[PDB]
Structures are given as C-alpha cells and as structure tokens.
Design a protein around this ligand. Structure first.
Ligand SMILES: *[C@@H]1O[C@H](CO)[C@@H](O[C@@H]2O[C@H](CO)[C@@H](O)[C@H](O)[C@H]2NC(C)=O)[C@H](O)[C@H]1NC(C)=O
Ligand SMILES: O=C(Nc1ccccc1)N[C@H]1C[C@H](C(=O)O)Nc2cc(Cl)cc(Cl)c21
Ligand SMILES: *[C@@H]1O[C@H](CO)[C@@H](O)[C@H](O)[C@H]1NC(C)=O
Lengths: 381, 405, 134, 49
C-alpha cells in the first residue's frame, strides 16, 4: 500500500520495486510493522536558508526524517559529507556513478550509389578510349572484321566470353596483350577504392565521459543538461572547473527527468547527464538509447536512520550479510538486468537493397532498350 | 604491504633515512630495523593527519597476513588489533561480516570484490562470415532478375533453349565457370553484355564488403560468471582445465563457506604468493585466476602488453569495499568518516588514483589479424555443399518418380 | 630548443612470410579431397541416368582456367555444379579478404612518444635509455 | 593464351591438347589466381594511408 498525496489529493495506491523488495526482505529479520507513504514535496532535501536570516532547513524527505515525521529512509538516497553531519548511514549496498545517455548511433548509413567510387569523368574517358583502341585494331588488322574487333575490345573489359574474334596481325596482337593489362588494372583499382570507402567510413565516435574534450567548450550540436535543483550540481557548480558547462546547462536545461528521455527520443536532446543506475536500466529497455562507458562521481546509495537509533549498527550488519548471499545480485538480474540489446563498435554495415538498387536501374534500362533495338534487325534486313 | 597500496623500501644513506614523500615504517619486526613506506593509503593518512592532526607510529605485522582467524584466535592486522596492541590499522583490507563484528569499520573509499583473470584470446571470427555482407533481399532479387532476363531472351530469340540460358547466366555471376552455346542475334548479345556489367559490379562490391567484417572486433571468449557450468561442473563440458586462488585470505570464506565443489577442486591448484599465478598464466600453466578486484584491475593495466584482461569488468561478484579499521567503539570512528567523506567531494580521490592506479591498456586494442585454420567457422558453406548433395539425391529420385509413369 | 628521444628506423619491409599463410594446412587438404569427391559424384550421376572429363571440369572450375570442354548431360549434375561454382567463388573471395586483412592491420610497433609515454612510467627491459652521467 | 590468362581471361583460344600439357597449364592457372588476388589485396592498402 502507498498513500500518495500527489494524485491536493491524498490517494491510496500501490507501490513496489527493487528497494521495496529489499525492505520486505529485511522485514523478516527484525519483526517490522510499518506503514508506507510518499513525500509531499517530491524532492530529497538540502540545507537551505529560510526566512532570509532565520534558519537552515531541509527541503524534503531528509527533513521529514529530521523533522520527526519519518523514521528510516529506503530509496536511492545519495551519500556525501554535507548530509553526514545529521544522519547515520549504513554501509552502502549498491555502488553507482555518473554517466551520459545518447541514442543509437548508426545501424546502416554507408553507401549511396554504385558509380560512387569513380566520378563521371573517367567513366566517359574509358568509354571513349575503348572504341578508340577498337578502331585502331581494326585498321591495323585491315591493312597488313570490324564488328568482330568492336566486340573483342568492348567485351574483354567486361570479363565475358562473347564472340570468338582474334587478331590475325602482329601489331594488333602486341597491342591487345597490354589492352588486357589495362582492363585488369581498372577493375582492381575499382575494388580497392570501394573497399577503402567501406572500411574507413567512421560515422562518429560515441562521446566519452565527462572528460570528453568536445565538452571542454561545447558546440551547439551537443544539447545536454540536468534537472534544475538536483543533487548533481553540488558537484557541478560547487566545482570551479565546470562553471562553463554549468552556464551551458542552465541555458539548455530540460523540464523533467522524464522530459529528458522524451527529448532524447525526440531527436532534440543528443546527450544527457545523470547517475549510472538510473539510465542504465532504461538503456537495456529503450534499445534505441545507450550510455557511455565511464564513471565520474564515485559513490553508492545507502539506508538512512535518525541519529543513533538503537539498531543502526544492527541493520547495517544485516545489509552487509544479505549483500553477498545472492540477494543483491539475483535481485539485479531479475530487476535491473534485461540485457535485451547489446551494441558494439561501428558495425561493418551490411548491404541493403535500397543503396544497391542503382544497378537494377541499368538492368531495367537494358530491358527497355531491348524491345526498342529488336526491330532494328528486321529493318536492317 | 601486499600490493600496490603500500610499498616497503629499505634505508637510504644519502638523504637521512630515505627520500621525502614517504614515511618511516619503523618496525622492530624480528628479534628497531627501520624501513620506509609510500603508496596509496599512505597518502590518505598524510591527509587524515591534516584534519585530525595526531601523532602515529608505523609498525608492520608479525605474520604478514590479511586476517583469517583460527580457534577464535585472530591473525593478521586484525589479529593485532583484536588484542589492542595497536589502536588502528589501515591499508589493503576488505570488509566482511565476521570481520565487521569484532571491530568496527569506516566508510569505504574504493570499491572491490571478486573477478576473474585469464590469458586473453586468439582472434576468433564468427561462423557467419560468408553470409554477412548482404541483406537477404538482393539474394532473391538475383533469381528475380535472372528469370526476367531469361524471358527477355525468349522474346529476343523468337525473332538455344530456355532450359539452358539460365545455366550460362547463373554461371556468369560466379566468375565464369565454363563457356557454353553463346546465343546469337545482335539484340540478345546486347542484353547479355549488359548483364555482365551487373555481374562485375556485384562480385566486386561483394569482395569489397567482405573485406570489412575481418577488420572489426570479437572475443568475449571466456565466461559468464560463477554460475557457469564451466566453473561449477569441473569436467562435464571440458575435462582438463583448472583454476584457483590464493589461500590464507578473505576471498576464501566467501567461496568455501557458501559454495561446495570449487573449494575441494581448487584445494590442489593453489599457489603461495600472489605473482606465482602471474608466472603460471604467463606460460599457460594455469587456466583462470580468482582474487580480489582492485589488485587485479591494477595488475592487468600495467603488464608488458595486455594479454591478460578481466572478464568483462562491468560485472562484479560480492561487491564490497575497503576501509579503515578502528579498535572497538572508540570515539574516533565518527571523525575519520567525517574526514574521508570530504575527499570524495574535493576531487582528491581521482587525484590520488591518477597518482597510482591508472592502467596502460585503456584504449580498445587493435582487433588482431585472425589467421584461420578455422574449418569450424567456414563450416556453414561446407554444410550448404552437403545440402546441395542432398538436393541432388532427391532430384535423382524425381527421375525414377517420373520414370515409372 | 627542447628535449627529445632518438630511435633507429623502425621497419621498411617486415610483413609477409609465405603465400599459404592466410589459410592453414587443414582446409587446403579438405578442399583438395572434396573436389575429387564431388567429381566422382558427378561422374556417377551422369553415368547412370566421361570420367576424366568430369575430373577436369571439376578440378578446373576451381582454378578459373578454361581447360576442357566438358559439361553435364544429366539434370542432377547440372543442379549440383551450379552451386559447386558458388563454393568456388566463395573460397577465392574469402582468401582475398583474409590476405587483405593480414596486410592492412600489421602494425609492427608505434614509435615511442615523448617522455610521457606510459611504456616509460616503469620501463620494460626492452627499453634501454639513459643520459651522460653528470 | 598464357599471357592472357594472368590478366583475367581476355578471350579463349586453341587449347593445347595432350594430358601433360593440360596439366602444366592448369598448374599455371593456380599461380595466376594467386597473383591477381594478392595484387588486389595489396592495392587495397595504399588507399588507407
Ligand atoms: C596459510 O595457509 C597455509 C596452508 O594453506 C598454512 O600455512 C601453514 O602455515 C602455518 C604458518 O606458517 C604453519 O604453521 C602450517 O604448518 C602450514 N601448513 C602446513 C600444512 O604445513 C596456514 O593454514 C595459513 N597460515 C597463515 C600464516 O596464514
Ligand atoms: O534530482 C533529483 N530531483 C529532481 C527532480 C526534478 C528536477 C530536478 C531535480 N533528485 C536526486 C537527489 C535524490 C537523491 O537521493 O539522490 N533523489 C534522487 C534519486 C535518484 Cl534515483 C536520482 C537522483 Cl539524480 C536523485
Ligand atoms: C593464441 O592462443 C594460444 C593459447 O592461448 C597461443 O598460441 C597464443 O596465446 C595465441 N597466439 C598468438 C600468435 O599469440
């Protein structure tokens, strides 16, 4: 049961999940009877000056613990110095860090058309030179079989076995013997160039952690931010070497944590900063979106208690002993480990029809040219 | 000192007892034989003393162990804090429960656990090598265009035999099996010459792309985790391979006292001393190695060449932390915590890390040339060959099938 | 001016050893057997509704030559050879690809880069280097 | 004929008969197919530096 006052509507609904699982597990150890409710403010809490000179208060669930409302916190509550002066923390049960989100990069974006490795000039150049050498062979054979030689030439380039022509001269022979070499060279170089184009088409490298130099000062092709008034700025703004990124974010900020995913999937945010185990469980579910391999802020959540409850030490011992049997690992496997998708380096971009279709257009060109050319025999006869 | 966290060093006669940036380990070990020490945790003590500001000796351990107990009597640094001969112990030390009970523990400052080390791999290539460079679509559009152009050949020579032109055409794509009856007639010859162009473009583009799949990565190559039959079944799938750990340590009880077989199986392939296993894995003497996390995540990244890499670091087993051990219920336990939780905020942790911990092979190494005797991965084409042979036998069956009628 | 390091010329030509290298002896003999296998199979399939002929045809088509004017007169032999040819093409293709791979990603060694080269963070004994004392 | 064979099969001609001859020429074709292949392989390097 879960009495959520943010439906002014206090409504009883239900709630569950990884944390709830750990709680319901731990319960059997120490005979816990417990109601459960949510936070009206919907934020963790931090030390903030109030009444403009009067006091320093905690604006959230942390305060609700200190205020006397709550008695123990179970949620992804962070650990640092500032909070440690008024709470008591169990050992951490789930380490984590700071990462970035980006959509899937490119499954197939490589080739356009088949003539691409050459450029139109050399095409027409060889198309001319072939008839050139053809008629030259023709004369050299004629004056010590025209259509014959025209075939022989314009075929040998095309690897076919059409026509049974030959040279009867000596000049034509010594010429064709290297005409063949030029033929082989063209096809060779063509293959080599196409291979080059298909192997060194690196679309883009996935941006690498916070220390990626592209972020040293960002180009406007890097939209990224956090949620205004999070606990991450306590390491962004409180650090001096990030104030530039701080200004970029305060201007690029997105509305909601869910608005971040909405905007990334909307091709309007192309990178997003947050904690590891918050996005990583959405990458392996939202297969079009994955993280970066790096970790920025070393910390791990834990359970909070009012200062010096008579079992602080006890629950910490239990959460330790219950961390290595199988509980955390198995609960992750069944609760955070979809493993539905697995990305890699820039794949070798399997060929699709839509960029290999161009040659079929010349196939259709031959098809149509047939029924035209056919009656030319009937005419010439 | 049992790792790149504390370093022992003898005495220097030039600059006093030894250099700066190190602190004298003055331990009358065996009988005031002075040494001096430096490293990672030494640095963190030299910053603890900047906000608790006390005085401290530095004397090593009688037994050089990590803290296993016997008959309730304790050994190791724990063994010399339980008797409170020494008010506090730091350095490389895990955090379990049977240790968490006798004394207390601070907030951890670098996370560790269990992982596995193994000689890395050869260069494997998927059995699917042949099929890769195309979508299945073109592979049927092939037959489509073949049949339609054969029909056009029908139309043309109306003005060979159509159970034969297919033979020539299909042959031409696969680089000129054997010449046959060339269809006469100028128009026909034009159409076929056109087809040859599509051929030469096709085979070329093929070779081009198939010259890509052999230039990208591979080789997960080792395991899934402690749940694999590979580990728990010693001889089922592969009989002879064998691994182990080092006894005397923390990582024992978190396997023996919870897993059954691997303990009695490793009881015959354990090595005294850490780097003995490094020597073994250098020459294939042992197959796999299990130990603490951080010592491994270091020892790999600074070898000669990264021929020895973790098994998918992103996965860990029984993730716990190091820490700082204090005598029972002293009032200090708070301050040190309040102390250390500052340094995570001040970036100094990453600083000391870069001062010691970074490894060389951080970048993705070059996907190695996979020279192949690989009958295994090229097998699929042999199996399609056999499938052709079966189609042959059944087609011959069709002969008699028509023949009785 | 500044501070630098000296190393001899790295490698002008140190790449290839032998032509059979991209394959390894097993597959060689495998195809060498299978060719005669399919040859005699074609022979029988044509014989029982020209032996040396078929032996040529087969053991030639692998070699791209134009030797011999054989053919199949059956239907089974025809449908078999039509894909025998495909296997032929595949072998040569893969061979070219593998040799290209071996010739393109043979990086002998990268020239050591300045003082901040990590190989020097602690040196291997394959890095002899010093100055003049004093 | 021989010179033609190296450069990928210009045009068929009078095939010399006799079993021994045919053996020798079939051998030569092997050298051919290895040669053209190795060529294309290497020429697929100079365009990657
Ligand atoms: C470490 O484990 C080994 C056995 O795995 C044992 O070391 C033995 O070492 C102690 C102390 O030197 C000796 O008293 C024993 O006789 C040794 N065993 C045998 C069979 O001879 C011991 O269990 C552990 N010792 C330490 C210091 O950790
Ligand atoms: O940033 C916020 N709230 C916010 C909401 C809308 C707009 C801006 C900020 N909360 C943080 C702090 C708090 C914590 O204990 O870490 N809850 C919590 C829990 C998880 Cl799992 C991840 C984070 Cl970042 C957070
Ligand atoms: C391939 O692996 C085996 C054993 O692992 C060994 O020959 C070597 O490590 C690898 N080969 C090369 C050439 O390094």
């Amino acid at each position: 049961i879960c009495t959520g006052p943010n439906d002014r509507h206090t409504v009883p609904q239900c709630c569950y999940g990884f944390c709830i699982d750990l709680l319901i597990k731990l319960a059997r150890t120490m005979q816990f009877t417990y109601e459960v409710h949510l936070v009206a403010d919907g934020k963790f809490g931090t030390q903030e000056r109030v009444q403009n000179s009067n006091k320093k208060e905690w604006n959230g669930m942390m305060g609700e613990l200190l205020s006397g409302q709550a008695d123990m916190i179970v949620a992804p509550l962070t650990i640092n110095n500032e909070r440690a002066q008024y709470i008591e923390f169990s050992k951490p049960f789930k380490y984590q860090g700071l990462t970035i989100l980006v959509k899937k990069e490119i499954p197939r974006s490589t080739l356009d058309s088949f003539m691409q490795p050459f450029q139109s000039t050399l095409w027409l150049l060889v198309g001319l030179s072939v008839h050139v050498v053809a008629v030259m062979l023709y004369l050299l054979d004629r004056f010590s079989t025209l259509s014959s030689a025209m075939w022989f030439s314009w075929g040998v380039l095309l690897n076919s076995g059409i026509g049974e022509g030959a040279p009867r001269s000596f000049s034509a022979r010594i010429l064709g013997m290297v005409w063949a070499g030029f033929a082989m060279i063209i096809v060779a170089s063509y293959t080599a160039n196409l291979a080059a184009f298909l192997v060194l088409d690196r679309p883009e490298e996935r941006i690498t952690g916070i220390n990626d130099p592209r972020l040293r000062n960002p180009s406007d092709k890097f939209i990224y931010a956090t949620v205004k008034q999070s606990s991450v700025d306590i390491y962004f703004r409180r650090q001096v070497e990030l104030s530039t990124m701080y200004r970029h974010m305060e201007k690029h900020n997105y509305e909601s944590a869910a608005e971040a995913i909405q905007a990334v999937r909307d091709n309007k945010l192309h990178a997003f900063i947050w904690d590891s185990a918050v996005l990583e469980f959405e990458a392996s579910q939202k297969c079009d979106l994955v993280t970066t391999g790096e970790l920025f802020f070393r910390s791990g959540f834990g359970i909070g208690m009012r200062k010096d409850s008579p079992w602080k030490q006890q629950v910490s011992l239990s959460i330790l002993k219950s961390h290595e049997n199988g509980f955390m690992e198995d609960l992750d496997k069944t609760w955070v480990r979809y493993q539905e998708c697995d990305s890699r380096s820039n794949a070798p971009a399997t060929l699709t029809c839509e960029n290999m279709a161009g040659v079929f257009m010349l196939v259709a060109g031959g098809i149509v040219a047939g029924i035209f050319l056919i009656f030319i025999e009937i005419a010439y006869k | 000192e049992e790792a790149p966290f504390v370093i022992v060093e003898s005495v220097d006669p030039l600059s006093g007892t030894c250099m700066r940036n190190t602190v004298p380990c003055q331990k009358r070990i065996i009988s005031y034989i002075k040494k001096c020490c430096k490293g990672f945790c030494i640095d963190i003590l030299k910053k603890i003393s900047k906000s608790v500001k006390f005085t401290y000796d530095l004397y090593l351990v009688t037994n050089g162990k990590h803290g296993k107990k016997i008959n309730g009597t304790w050994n190791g640094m724990i063994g010399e804090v339980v008797m409170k001969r020494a008010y506090m112990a730091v350095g490389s030390l895990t955090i379990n429960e049977e240790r968490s009970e006798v004394v207390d523990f601070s907030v951890p400052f670098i996370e560790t656990g269990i992982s596995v080390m193994v000689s890395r791999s050869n260069g494997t290539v998927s059995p699917s090598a042949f099929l890769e460079p195309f979508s299945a679509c073109v592979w049927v559009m092939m037959f489509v265009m073949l049949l339609i152009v054969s029909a056009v050949a029908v139309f043309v020579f109306e003005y060979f035999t159509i159970g034969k032109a297919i033979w020539l055409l299909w042959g031409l794509v696969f680089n000129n099996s054997v010449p046959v009856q060339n269809p006469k007639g100028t128009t026909s010859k034009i159409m076929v010459s056109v087809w040859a162009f599509f051929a030469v473009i096709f085979l070329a583009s093929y070779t081009a792309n198939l010259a890509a799949f052999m230039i990208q990565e591979e080789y997960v190559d080792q395991v899934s985790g402690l749940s694999d039959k590979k580990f728990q079944r010693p001889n089922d799938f592969s009989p002879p391979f064998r691994f182990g750990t080092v006894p005397n340590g923390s990582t024992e009880r978190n396997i023996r006292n919870n897993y059954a077989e691997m303990h009695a199986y490793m009881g015959k392939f354990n090595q005294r001393g850490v780097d003995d296993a490094l020597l073994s894995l250098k020459t294939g003497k042992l197959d796999a190695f299990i130990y603490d996390a951080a010592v491994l995540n270091y020892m790999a990244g600074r070898d000669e060449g990264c021929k020895l890499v973790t098994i998918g670091s992103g996965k860990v087993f029984a993730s716990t932390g190091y820490g700082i051990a204090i005598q029972k219920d002293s009032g200090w336990k708070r301050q040190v915590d309040l102390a250390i939780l500052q340094l995570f905020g001040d970036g100094e942790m990453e600083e000391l890390e870069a001062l010691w911990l970074t490894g060389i092979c951080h970048n993705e190494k070059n996907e190695v040339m996979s020279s192949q005797l690989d009958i295994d991965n090229m097998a699929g084409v042999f199996y399609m060959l056999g499938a052709a042979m079966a189609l042959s036998l059944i087609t011959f069956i069709s002969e008699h099938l028509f023949y009785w009628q």
